[PDB]
Amino acid sequence: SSSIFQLRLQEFANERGMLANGRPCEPGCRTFFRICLKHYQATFSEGPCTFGNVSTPVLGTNSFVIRDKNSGRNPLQLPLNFTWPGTFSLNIQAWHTPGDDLRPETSPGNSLISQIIIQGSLAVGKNWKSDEQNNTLTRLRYSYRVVCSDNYYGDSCSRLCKKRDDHFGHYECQPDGSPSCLPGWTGKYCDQPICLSGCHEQNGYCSKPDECNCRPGWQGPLCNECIPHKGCRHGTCTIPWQCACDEGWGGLFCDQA
């Protein structure tokens, strides 16, 4: 379940309440919808719904406006066992039932009202693509989109990004799934601390952001200052464990003119 097909039913117009067979609904068209999502096939429609099928309860009678439901479940949800192919075929059927609204598909008196069919290309995104289908009997206005499952990113929803702020990483999530490093961190997964400004890259290191610790033989705020050979009295250093004598001094530890 890496990607999700969403289908929002908006408005359905069915005056007179006429079935397919030309007979009027009695007393009224208790309308529920069957949706069939399957692969793009230019040839005539064959086989089952390969992308998943779904039946809705009765939403209205004859002509009615369909409201969104956060918890029926509008817009409709179709979780996919696969990565979105890019092409699709959509089949929306309007039905009538004389039975209960709970599972209208479970009724013997079910009769078809009208149906539409569309197929083509669609790219993953939060952008709703809207479409209308008018005929002499019915009108259907709807919208649909393909989005990624939560915490999933990329053009094909093939990359996971859960935000971290612990030992394994300190980052946020970019739209493409790549980590956006929190301030004071760097790397691929933002788990490398950014040492204090000016801390010696070669002789210094850190375990926490804005810290500077000195590798053996160095000291100071920026670990850029050497420590002269142990026992160096009148001499300096450039490299740790050195004793370069000053003026008028000599000997290993610089202590004799």
Partner: protein, 113 residues
Amino acid sequence: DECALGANPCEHAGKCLNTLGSFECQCLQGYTGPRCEIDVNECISNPCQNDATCLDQIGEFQCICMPGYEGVYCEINTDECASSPCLHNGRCVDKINEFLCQCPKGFSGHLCQ
């Protein structure tokens, strides 16, 4: 070492393995990347023929064949005459998701019956 330090850095139920001073993720089948956060596309090899459609699933690939073709890679043109359909010594002609029975004189119908 690295793995006991709380949560799991391997996201899709991958196993944490400790290296020294670091770690590496043992990814389950169908997942790649340093920490198994990327779904592997199983349909890169374009395994299926005859104008089929490849579906990238989790850990495996699935193909939808054009009508008349079958098999895992949609490699088999279905012999629609395999079941010996035409009766009473009729002749069988396989095509694509379709079969025709040559009817000897005196017999008619779909199956020449």
